[PDB]
Amino acid sequence: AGPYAVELGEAGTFTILSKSGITDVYPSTVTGNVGTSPITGAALLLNCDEVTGAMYTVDSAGPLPCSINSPYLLELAVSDMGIAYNDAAGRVPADHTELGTGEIGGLTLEPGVYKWSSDVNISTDVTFNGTMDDVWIMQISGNLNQANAKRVTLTGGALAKNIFWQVAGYTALGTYASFEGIVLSKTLISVNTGTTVNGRLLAQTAVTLQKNTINAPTEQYEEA
Secondary structure (H helix, E strand, C coil): CCCCCCCCHHHHHEEEEECCCEEEECCCEEECEEEECCCCHHHECCCHHHECCCEEECCCCCCCCCEEECHHHHHHHHHHHHHHHHHHHCCCCCCEECHHHHECCCCEECCEEEEECCCEEECCCEEEECCCCCCEEEEECCCEEECCCCEEEEECCCCHHHEEEEECCCEEECCCCEEEEEEEECCCEEECCCCEEEEEEEECCCEEEECCEEECCCCCCCCC
16 A cells, blocks of 8 residues: 655665764664765764674775775765655655644554655654555654654554655754654754664764664664
8 A cells, every 4th residue: 555665775784974074972773784975984973883783984984993994885875865855756646645733643644645845744653554554654844853751653564664764954862762764864863762663764964863772764663
């Protein structure tokens, strides 16, 4: 049900990919690969002990000892991230428009294309219900804000890898929250203290983490 998946290309191998750096208030745990490009590896400020996969940089200025000078792989990933963002933004028709006038807390969302010409807030828990094949594309022209202690909940077999948040503003998640899905942010993605994300944080500017657990989303029924 709903639209077809958004193909991520080489971006889909990263748990965090940004263009202008990754910041962190230690300690966070990122299970997956991270990278940043075209900015120097000096702007990737995670510690090698916070990443269980690979850390890629454009140069040899990134974290030691683990970072990998891999500018071409990163160029492809960053390219595919921008293709993904535009693919998601362009899907049609929208199944719902202006749902909740941008407040989605307190809703169960069926598979579909959702569009808001505003900011979107998750001020209380929000649920995504469908099977493992269903897809949600969230087209947000404002900013995406999740309130402290709130959650994106998955039911029915819904997978985080199938939920696409296309955010033309910034994405800011509060503290001690739990978030699911692929964030294709045009600008920054900020994740506040203690929050868990099962998903991918794909920002066209920077990613900022504060004591978070960031997990790549699983291929089939797991990690919850």
